[PDB]
């Protein structure tokens, strides 16, 4: 039965994937079901690419649809259905597994006597919305994302796996649509909750790393470019050519150099077509990032227009508008005097506190310790007589 299948799999398999197969059978015989889960997983980590994946799933699922925890079951199937090209086939298999699980859980809840099985379902649901995006039915996929988000969050406790799957689905939907703003929000989340699994391929990491950097050029509130670079997703992937000139842009934003910026952008505006259509945003973005830099360093409460004119190299007409933009972002607060040509900044938005600044804080706090101290001691002495 299951024996004839094991023969075909071993032979065309690599001779280094050969003993994985032998182990499967042995663990079944002995009824170690824990070990058995384990060995299955070892196959799908790295042999999901190969043509044998699909086969192993119909047979394995039918045999071990009761032994191993439920969440184990759906995870294996998922991997198989990425390399499954046909997206009507993917959708078929999904609905069969969805029914399967609902029935199973009814008995099984009572055998365990306690286990949340509503987890498996949510994962199934998540994947179906994913089918739809690939076939470009954004409308169906949308209301299914909605409902997912509500039930999940009503939960007071959630595993990483479930919320990770749901964010993946979202991420894909936002870049397809060509909405830079939304994707940036998702991508961050996805990174935070990211499974300790290394099943996540380098290719997947590299493609996301690419979309995040393009989002942040175009962005609506990102000035956090340095912080972003410090995370594994970009941090390691720097010698590659795609991640060179790219990262060069991020770093040009930090120092606000106008000159390096101009050279990069001229070449690359043709190359990446996202940047062509979003030209206004990108062009504003260098100018803004310079403005935030000039403002933060001069902590005095007023700046002439002349400071801005020179740093951003723009005419004065454009200056007061640029001053309107910062204020609309909420990055800055204050008022504009046109009669004297001033910007009175009255609020600065906190940024990354460098080491030097830790010392600065401390120096002022000592001074203000002393003031309280001097003042209490003298005033006790004054009118000492009455303190009932």
């Amino acid at each position: 039965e299951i024996d004839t299948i094991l023969s075909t799999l071993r032979m065309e398999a690599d001779p280094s994937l050969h003993p994985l197969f032998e182990q499967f059978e042995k663990f079944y015989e002995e009824k170690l079901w824990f070990q058995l889960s384990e060995s299955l997983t070892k196959f799908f980590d790295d042999a999901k690419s190969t043509p044998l994946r699909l086969r192993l799933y119909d047979n394995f699922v039918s045999k071990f649809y009761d032994k191993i925890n439920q969440l184990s079951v759906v995870k294996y199937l998922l991997a198989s259905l990425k390399d499954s090209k046909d997206f009507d086939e993917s959708l078929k298999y999904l609905d069969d597994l969805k029914a399967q699980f609902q029935e199973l859980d009814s008995k099984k809840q009572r055998n365990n006597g306690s286990k949340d099985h509503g987890d498996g379902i949510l994962l199934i649901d998540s994947e179906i919305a994913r089918t739809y995006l690939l076939k470009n039915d954004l409308v169906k996929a949308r209301d299914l994302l909605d409902d997912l988000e509500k039930t999940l969050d009503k939960k007071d406790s959630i595993p990483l796996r479930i919320t990770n799957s749901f964010y993946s689905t979202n991420s894909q939907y936002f870049k397809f649509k060509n909405d830079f703003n939304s994707f940036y929000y998702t991508s961050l989340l996805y990174l935070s909750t990211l499974e300790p699994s290394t099943s996540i391929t380098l290719a997947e990491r590299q493609q996301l790393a690419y979309d995040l950097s393009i989002s942040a050029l175009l962005g609506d509130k990102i000035y956090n470019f340095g912080e972003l670079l410090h995370h594994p997703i970009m941090e390691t992937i720097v010698n590659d050519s795609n991640y060179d000139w790219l990262f060069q842009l991020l770093n040009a934003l930090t120092v606000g150099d106008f000159d390096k910026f101009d050279s990069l952008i001229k070449v690359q505006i043709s190359k990446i077509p996202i940047l062509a259509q979003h030209e206004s945003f990108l062009r504003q973005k260098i100018c803004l990032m310079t403005l935030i830099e000039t403002v933060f360093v001069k902590n005095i409460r007023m700046l002439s227009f002349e400071d801005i004119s020179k740093a951003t190299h723009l005419p004065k007409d454009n200056v007061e508008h640029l001053v309107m933009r910062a204020i609309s972002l909420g990055l800055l607060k204050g008022s504009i005097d046109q009669v004297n040509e001033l910007v009175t900044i009255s609020w600065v938005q906190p940024r990354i506190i460098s080491g030097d600044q830790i010392t600065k804080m401390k120096d002022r706090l000592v001074e203000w310790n002393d003031q309280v101290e001097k003042l209490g001691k003298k005033m006790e002495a004054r009118g000492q007589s009455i303190w009932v």
């Binding site: 002995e30 009824k31 170690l32 079901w33 824990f34 925890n69 055998n111 365990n112 306690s114 286990k115």
Partner: protein
């Protein structure tokens, strides 16, 4: 054996959802928690048993020493099948539960199930071994998890710890293959043990 308070450690590691004991290893254990309570009672009806878990990061006191079958059962229903066994925590907590009792005349026994290999640090075990002697506690291990492929860290310790006395700590190694865990416990000494005095 006579007038005895027992902390039973029921463990529900990731290896306990297996099926070495047919049909399912979990269900063979459920029956054993029930049976242990009954065997001890049948000995001497003034015996009591309380319950703590091996499952999770840490133990949870489900039930203190009691005569009600009902408390052990509600506790038994509470499980997590992805729990994990840590030998050291279970021992330590068991001794503490023993310090307070409905009747403090009662003798001090730990029964613990082992359903996964044990890889806790050795240092921890050495020290616990002689702690136990201070407070004069005996312990019976129903072993069927450890032996499957991993040498016994506890046997020698228990052996050394025991004195001439009615109480007798033991290493009990019970055939781990399909034979039903509960059936084998009934058919081996657990209240047919003889005194050492």
């Amino acid at each position: 054996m006579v007038l005895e308070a027992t902390v039973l450690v029921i463990d529900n590691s990731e290896y306990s959802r297996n099926g070495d004991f047919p049909r399912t290893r979990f269900e063979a254990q459920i029956d054993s928690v029930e049976f242990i309570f009954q065997a001890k009672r049948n000995s001497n009806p003034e015996n009591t048993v309380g319950l703590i878990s091996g499952a999770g990061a840490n133990p949870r006191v489900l039930s203190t020493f009691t005569a009600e079958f009902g408390k052990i059962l509600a506790g038994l229903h509470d499980t997590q099948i992805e729990g994990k066994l840590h030998m050291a925590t279970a021992l330590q907590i068991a001794q503490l539960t023993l310090k307070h009792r409905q009747n403090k005349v009662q003798h001090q026994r730990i029964v613990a199930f082992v359903c996964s290999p044990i890889s806790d640090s050795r240092d921890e075990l050495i020290r616990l071994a002689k702690t136990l002697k201070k407070n004069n506690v005996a312990v019976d291990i129903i072993n069927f998890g450890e032996i499957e492929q991993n040498t016994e860290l506890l046997d020698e310790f228990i052996a050394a710890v025991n004195n001439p006395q009615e109480e007798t700590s033991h290493l009990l190694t019970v055939t781990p293959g399909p034979r039903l865990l509960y059936e084998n416990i009934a058919s081996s000494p657990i209240i047919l043990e003889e005194g050492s005095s």
